[PDB]
Amino acid sequence: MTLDVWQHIRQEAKELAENEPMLASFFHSTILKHQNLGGALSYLLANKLANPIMPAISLREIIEEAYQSNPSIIDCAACDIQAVRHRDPAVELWSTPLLYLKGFHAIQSYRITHYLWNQNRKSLALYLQNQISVAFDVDIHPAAKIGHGIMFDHATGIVVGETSVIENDVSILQGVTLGGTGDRHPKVREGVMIGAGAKILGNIEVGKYAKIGANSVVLNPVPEYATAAGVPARIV
Amino acid sequence: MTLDVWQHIRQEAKELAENEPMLASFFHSTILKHQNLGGALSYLLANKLANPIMPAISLREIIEEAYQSNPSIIDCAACDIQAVRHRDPAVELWSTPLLYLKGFHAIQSYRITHYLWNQNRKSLALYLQNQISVAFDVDIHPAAKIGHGIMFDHATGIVVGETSVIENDVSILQGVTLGGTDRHPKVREGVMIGAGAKILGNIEVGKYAKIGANSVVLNPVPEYATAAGVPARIV
Amino acid sequence: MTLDVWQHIRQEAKELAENEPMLASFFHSTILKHQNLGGALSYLLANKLANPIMPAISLREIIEEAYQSNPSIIDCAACDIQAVRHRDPAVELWSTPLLYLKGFHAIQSYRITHYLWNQNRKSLALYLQNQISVAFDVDIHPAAKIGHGIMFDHATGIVVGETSVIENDVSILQGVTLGGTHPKVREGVMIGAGAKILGNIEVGKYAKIGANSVVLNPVPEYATAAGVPARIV
Amino acid sequence: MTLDVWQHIRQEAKELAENEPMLASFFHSTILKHQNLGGALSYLLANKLANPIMPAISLREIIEEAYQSNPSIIDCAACDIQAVRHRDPAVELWSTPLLYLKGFHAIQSYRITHYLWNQNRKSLALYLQNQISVAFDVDIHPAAKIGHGIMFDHATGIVVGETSVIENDVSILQGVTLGGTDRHPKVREGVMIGAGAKILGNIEVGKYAKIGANSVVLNPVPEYATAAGVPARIV
Amino acid sequence: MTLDVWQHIRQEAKELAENEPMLASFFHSTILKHQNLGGALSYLLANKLANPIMPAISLREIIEEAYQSNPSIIDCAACDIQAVRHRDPAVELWSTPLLYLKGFHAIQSYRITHYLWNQNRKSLALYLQNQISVAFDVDIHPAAKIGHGIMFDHATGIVVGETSVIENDVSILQGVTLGGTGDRHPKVREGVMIGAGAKILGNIEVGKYAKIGANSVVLNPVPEYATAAGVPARIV
Amino acid sequence: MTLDVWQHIRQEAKELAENEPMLASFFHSTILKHQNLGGALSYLLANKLANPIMPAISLREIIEEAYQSNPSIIDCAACDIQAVRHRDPAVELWSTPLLYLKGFHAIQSYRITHYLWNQNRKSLALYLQNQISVAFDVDIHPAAKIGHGIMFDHATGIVVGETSVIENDVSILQGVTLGGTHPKVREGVMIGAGAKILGNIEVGKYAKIGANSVVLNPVPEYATAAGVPARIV
Numbered sequence A, E: 001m002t003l004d005v006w007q008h009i010r011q012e013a014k015e016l017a018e019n020e021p022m023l024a025s026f027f028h029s030t031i032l033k034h035q036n037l038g039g040a041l042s043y044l045l046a047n048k049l050a051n052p053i054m055p056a057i058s059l060r061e062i063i064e065e066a067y068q069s070n071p072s073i074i075d076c077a078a079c080d081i082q083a084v085r086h087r088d089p090a091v092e093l094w095s096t097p098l099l100y101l102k103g104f105h106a107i108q109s110y111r112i113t114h115y116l117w118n119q120n121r122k123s124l125a126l127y128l129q130n131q132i133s134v135a136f137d138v139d140i141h142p143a144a145k146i147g148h149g150i151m152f153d154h155a156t157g158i159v160v161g162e163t164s165v166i167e168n169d170v171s172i173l174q175g176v177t178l179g180g181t182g183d184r185h186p187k188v189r190e191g192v193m194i195g196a197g198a199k200i201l202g203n204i205e206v207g208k209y210a211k212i213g214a215n216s217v218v219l220n221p222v223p224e225y226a227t228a229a230g231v232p233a234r235i236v
Numbered sequence B, D: 001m002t003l004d005v006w007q008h009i010r011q012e013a014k015e016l017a018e019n020e021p022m023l024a025s026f027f028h029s030t031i032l033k034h035q036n037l038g039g040a041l042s043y044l045l046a047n048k049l050a051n052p053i054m055p056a057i058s059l060r061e062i063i064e065e066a067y068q069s070n071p072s073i074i075d076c077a078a079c080d081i082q083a084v085r086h087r088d089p090a091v092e093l094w095s096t097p098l099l100y101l102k103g104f105h106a107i108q109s110y111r112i113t114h115y116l117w118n119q120n121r122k123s124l125a126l127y128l129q130n131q132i133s134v135a136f137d138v139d140i141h142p143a144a145k146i147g148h149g150i151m152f153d154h155a156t157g158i159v160v161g162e163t164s165v166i167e168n169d170v171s172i173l174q175g176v177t178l179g180g181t182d183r184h185p186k187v188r189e190g191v192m193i194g195a196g197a198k199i200l201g202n203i204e205v206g207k208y209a210k211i212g213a214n215s216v217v218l219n220p221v222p223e224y225a226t227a228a229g230v231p232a233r234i235v
Numbered sequence C, F: 001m002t003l004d005v006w007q008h009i010r011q012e013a014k015e016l017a018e019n020e021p022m023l024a025s026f027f028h029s030t031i032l033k034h035q036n037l038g039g040a041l042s043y044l045l046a047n048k049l050a051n052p053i054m055p056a057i058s059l060r061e062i063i064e065e066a067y068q069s070n071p072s073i074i075d076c077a078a079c080d081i082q083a084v085r086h087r088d089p090a091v092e093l094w095s096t097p098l099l100y101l102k103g104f105h106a107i108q109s110y111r112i113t114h115y116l117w118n119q120n121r122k123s124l125a126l127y128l129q130n131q132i133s134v135a136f137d138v139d140i141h142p143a144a145k146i147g148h149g150i151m152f153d154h155a156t157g158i159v160v161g162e163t164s165v166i167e168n169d170v171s172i173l174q175g176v177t178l179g180g181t182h183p184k185v186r187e188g189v190m191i192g193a194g195a196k197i198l199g200n201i202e203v204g205k206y207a208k209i210g211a212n213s214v215v216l217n218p219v220p221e222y223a224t225a226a227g228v229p230a231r232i233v
């Protein structure tokens, strides 16, 4: 439930603020003063994507309209907090992905642009896409397709092309590019783990549960449950 | 030509603001309220490079002085919008590169630093270079020589060394380093460099050559050739 | 000495402000108005990590708390300045690393998180760790151990894991990752641009890792590892 | 009625933005991009009351909650634009009071604090009262009762005590104090108070009375009368 | 000359910065890095009138266009710095009125709105008029007529009506209102000194070199060289 | 005691933050995260006097320099808090003056300028004097002498001249001017709203000045002066 992840987050925030006086204001502003995940998420995103030309107050108006028109966007977020939570040894707090992980922020921001790109509000989608790249150093074309339970660990330098597909429970590290030389982008299936720096190019298939070596340059489809590594990548 | 690009850009901004109420203010303050490309660009770049210590208002004075001093800088920008637009079917509006692409922004901010360095105003050149690296995550030394018709698509992690040169119509993708092992690469016109490529040393990359993603280029590459691999060999 | 490096910085800032009118304000605010490196460094760092939710005035309180508690943090900063200075003919001024190099800023910022982490103030360490990623495009777990004379040249995309150890005088370029399949990089080493060093493995003193290498096996002292996967070359 | 005022306001903003390129962004972000009076007002008031500690984004949440909770607040605002517009020939646009008059802003910010005080959220009421005093230089205690059709022309230095009441269609000018020597004034409808006037004590100021500039009112004033002087006598 | 007042100001700034390290940045930003009075004045005004909706960068664009279209506006400023300079015992520095006096800033800002009101750019004039009131607590209707050598000492609460006239070398203190009950506003002649809190109402004449008591309520014309005081004011 | 008033403030802030979710952040930033009144006061003041040219982080350095040099400045602040508290049934919390009353902020800000003025750092005193006018609509020359237990209620439009002297426990309302045709206001006095006291003249202990009065002649102890011009009434 969005309300159960939200419950853990609220309870954690209360504690964390009691233990860290220098951060209490922060916990109250992002979480404790909000009523639900969307309120906290939109407050967080408006502030992070904010700039001199489009202030946090104006960015938030945009994000809230999107959450109001399609509430499931928020649900995708709760599913994303959960995934990083146990697909990451160290992340034990539910509030950690929500508050600090730029890959998480990048994905949730992207979901906003995707909804917008589907409403044919492309100028708005392109504006956000690029502010997402400036703030988080993640560039996902609004038209790309991405499922839930997604993890962009560290995230710096991740580039996802216009025709890319990313299924559920995929994990992507820093420096990964999904791109090409119509469909000229990868179709990364369920559960795939992509190592740091890997460049996946072409309308090729990366089968469910496959693993990609760090720095690979994958050009040929990768079988399900297989490991692809090397430049160019071979099944290993 | 500036006037045509600018006019196309202006006509676009009008229709776009008309169709997207939420961005109307953005279109008006970045483009519509300005009279020429120079004013729109210096407005955007100052705001994107601004920080608490050097606010947009103060950085705009620097940018303006450079534009008033060397007007051809704005030209190179006009040529870059042109390239990006055509050389990337995806981009289908004159105003997109101006408004949204950080690679484009980083190059134009760079042309400003290059001028400052050529005028012996290095502390200013250095400050900007690094603010450019913070904003757009593109680090181009000010003494690097770069032509026009340049495309830094995505751009994250690009690093260009001090003695590098980049001729016209070159396209560079994310994570590309032009650096050392004169100690940096010389990229001739029409070269396409793939994502992640590391090109090391004062070596020649011939015109219209293609560099594969993640390659590590150590020896010269032949014009029209294709280099891929770690080390890069010809394929 | 922190007082030595500081004197050099003040002499330079005074002339730099003299020669560039449009930047004099900047030199006075970061350097000349302060009385020591700690004051300049905390001001610079608070301002760069600042955001709408936690402004510079608030972040500085945190950094100053740390510097007051452990003054040696500032000493490591003075040591890292020389390194980027001597280890790089491309940088000649003492104040250049302090003022403009994001890799340097990311390292000094990390040192603050590392101290907090060790005081068990982990939420503050995590908050900063991630603001460091946003501001400088560098992600170093506060638990990582990093000695001094460190140089993060260009820095973009550098990622260092929770159990990584980086000894003295190491240099690390853009796109470098130290983590798991975390690394132990001995003194004087380095990790060339785009290289990924993965696994509980050791990189010997003065070894060299080649651009875009993928290191999975230990690397010998003074050895040059390169390739995907890395091979002694 | 809100819908007519709002629609008039919107039609005005369109033409104005059309005629003044430099303010087009302002008109779009304050009015044009919003769907109702509530959104435009909460946007303006949050931005005008914002400070480094409580940014516009955070103050807007408070304002929104109050508007969603007690919708009639926005109404009183609509009635105040109406008054000002007509009761001051100088003002000749529905949008001017909304956009430019700080007296109008201070009253609407006040209605928010009054609601918060009535909901026993005093620390919030107190915070705003004082931020209102900083922004607009108008200090209205939150427990003061104020009707609609109110005009605070110029408004600088206005101070309204805790037990004050102000009925409909009252106009108050700069430097006016409604305070003590229940300990504050009761201003009936239609009263016009001149600049600098100090009205002290729980005394009645009858409907449609006129108070001269710089007067000091200590005894009750008769309806339709005119009080002027220090002390004020009837003239 | 605008260039001589500017010369004193520049030289003073250089010294003042050398003597006050904690303010050096300020002296460099407002004065020393600028080439002329207009550059320094517009930088100062854009920053002071700035707000979340219209940032200093955008306000400055407006002010610079005005100075470019009518450079004499700047000259009026130099004449104003001079007047406060010796019509005020304590003010010995030329840079003091320029940098710190809100009445001075208020007047110079007003001159911008007056030029704009004459170009029929009323929405812009009204916007500035009111931001001037918010920042400096001075409200001068753009249509009012005001000469040079003007001093708004302290300035808080000064209100100047739409049809008011203020001639050269007039001095006005805090709390002064020029207003009314067509011409329904005062015509304050050359050299008049108006005490704090005085309310001058009606299309009445205040003769050159007259003096107005603090807190007066002037309703009848005041003779040249005379003193008016009281509520209502009498010639005394 | 500053420690007494501080304890009261912390107890209140803790409950206030408890009862109002939308303001908890504010209470933690101004009060709870700090360890004493000086920390809270400088944070509050730096933030209110901040502007694009001199941000809060920069103004705080100046205030802290002053508080470090003359800790007693903070003691006068604690004393002024009680005054607004006891001298006003409309204010009941110790933290209300510290948090929300601009007259109080203007007074404490002035004290900083007064100290600088006396250290001969007049440009800094003048800069602040005028930022105080912009932020709080109060203009007090740094050279003015003002004792403690001072209450500037509502404050708007208050103007105090260079040679003015205000002793202890005085209360001054909005629109008040102390200057020349500067005043000497003895202990416990006051100056009602809109009153203008002009000339090198004396206002006696516990005297009362009526709203909009124009005082030109000395006023006797316990006397009530009112009128334009003021007359003993």
Ligand SMILES: CC(C)(COP(=O)(O)OP(=O)(O)OC[C@H]1O[C@@H](n2cnc3c(N)ncnc32)[C@H](O)[C@@H]1OP(=O)(O)O)[C@@H](O)C(=O)NCCC(=O)NCCS
Binding pocket: A154, A173, A194, A195, A196, A211, A212, A213, A214, A215, A216, A227, A228, A229, A230, A236, C159, C161, C177, C178, C179, C180, C181, C198, C214, C216, C228, C229
């Ligand atoms: C490929 C990977 C996923 C492990 O998968 P695996 O199925 O266990 O593969 P193995 O370890 O069995 O090794 C099989 C072959 O792959 C090679 N190999 C492993 N990783 C490689 C890489 N990144 N590039 C190229 N070759 C690689 C091995 O040397 C081995 O070769 P061999 O058959 O000649 O002996 C892993 O090595 C990797 O690259 N992980 C990236 C994780 C990462 O980026 N972490 C950073 C954390 S911040």
Ligand SMILES: CC(C)(COP(=O)(O)OP(=O)(O)OC[C@H]1O[C@@H](n2cnc3c(N)ncnc32)[C@H](O)[C@@H]1OP(=O)(O)O)[C@@H](O)C(=O)NCCC(=O)NCCS
Binding pocket: A159, A161, A177, A178, A179, A180, A181, A199, A201, A217, A219, A231, A232, B154, B173, B193, B194, B195, B210, B211, B212, B213, B214, B215, B226, B227, B228, B229, B235
């Ligand atoms: C090299 C490249 C430019 C295509 O060039 P090309 O002229 O078509 O050369 P080819 O595609 O015919 O490839 C020839 C050989 O190189 C190999 N190769 C291709 N790209 C390679 C790369 N990046 N690294 C290593 N080998 C590569 C192929 O497997 C092929 O092998 P073969 O010997 O069996 O014939 C391209 O594949 C590439 O690397 N593009 C990067 C673009 C990018 O980064 N896009 C991201 C967009 S966000």
Ligand SMILES: CC(C)(COP(=O)(O)OP(=O)(O)OC[C@H]1O[C@@H](n2cnc3c(N)ncnc32)[C@H](O)[C@@H]1OP(=O)(O)O)[C@@H](O)C(=O)NCCC(=O)NCCS
Binding pocket: B159, B161, B177, B178, B179, B180, B181, B200, B216, B218, B230, B231, C154, C173, C192, C193, C208, C209, C210, C211, C212, C213, C224, C225, C226, C227, C233
């Ligand atoms: C490791 C390094 C620092 C110096 O290496 P070295 O000890 O001098 O080794 P050499 O230069 O003699 O090269 C030896 C072999 O390595 C190969 N090699 C070198 N760098 C390589 C790389 N990155 N990937 C793959 N092979 C590489 C050479 O082709 C040579 O091949 P050989 O066995 O056929 O003789 C350097 O080669 C390198 O990669 N530097 C990157 C620095 C960088 O990132 N700069 C960016 C500045 S922004």
Ligand SMILES: CC(C)(COP(=O)(O)OP(=O)(O)OC[C@H]1O[C@@H](n2cnc3c(N)ncnc32)[C@H](O)[C@@H]1OP(=O)(O)O)[C@@H](O)C(=O)NCCC(=O)NCCS
Binding pocket: D154, D173, D193, D194, D195, D210, D211, D212, D213, D214, D215, D226, D227, D228, D229, D235, E159, E161, E177, E178, E179, E180, E181, E199, E201, E217, E219, E231, E232
């Ligand atoms: C009193 C006032 C409202 C007019 O009311 P009115 O009904 O016309 O009363 P009158 O004008 O006939 O004045 C009658 C007497 O009051 C006196 N008077 C008028 N205004 C006075 C004032 N503010 N204080 C003292 N006496 C005043 C007149 O001199 C006149 O004297 P008389 O006995 O010789 O006949 C008006 O003069 C006034 O004070 N207006 C203030 C408006 C203001 O502040 N405007 C600023 C706009 S920014």
Ligand SMILES: CC(C)(COP(=O)(O)OP(=O)(O)OC[C@H]1O[C@@H](n2cnc3c(N)ncnc32)[C@H](O)[C@@H]1OP(=O)(O)O)[C@@H](O)C(=O)NCCC(=O)NCCS
Binding pocket: E154, E173, E194, E195, E196, E211, E212, E213, E214, E215, E216, E227, E228, E229, E230, E236, F159, F161, F177, F178, F179, F180, F181, F198, F214, F216, F228, F229
């Ligand atoms: C009126 C003023 C300008 C002096 O002018 P002046 O021509 O010298 O007038 P005089 O002092 O000779 O006094 C003449 C009469 O005016 C009266 N008077 C003076 N100031 C008065 C005032 N503000 N209100 C009413 N009556 C006043 C005197 O009591 C005297 O009356 P008398 O003939 O019955 O004895 C002066 O008193 C004043 O009000 N100055 C204001 C300056 C100010 O606001 N300073 C604040 C600095 S921040």
Ligand SMILES: CC(C)(COP(=O)(O)OP(=O)(O)OC[C@H]1O[C@@H](n2cnc3c(N)ncnc32)[C@H](O)[C@@H]1OP(=O)(O)O)[C@@H](O)C(=O)NCCC(=O)NCCS
Binding pocket: D159, D161, D177, D178, D179, D180, D181, D200, D216, D218, D230, D231, F154, F173, F192, F193, F208, F209, F210, F211, F212, F213, F224, F225, F226, F227, F233
């Ligand atoms: C002075 C003051 C504090 C108390 O005065 P007091 O000692 O009780 O004097 P009194 O109330 O007995 O009044 C005595 C005479 O003064 C007159 N008077 C009082 N205040 C006056 C004023 N401001 N102007 C002119 N005359 C005044 C009375 O009408 C009375 O006249 P009388 O001689 O015919 O008997 C008070 O009258 C006053 O003006 N307070 C203003 C407080 C304020 O500004 N509050 C605003 C809260 S935001």
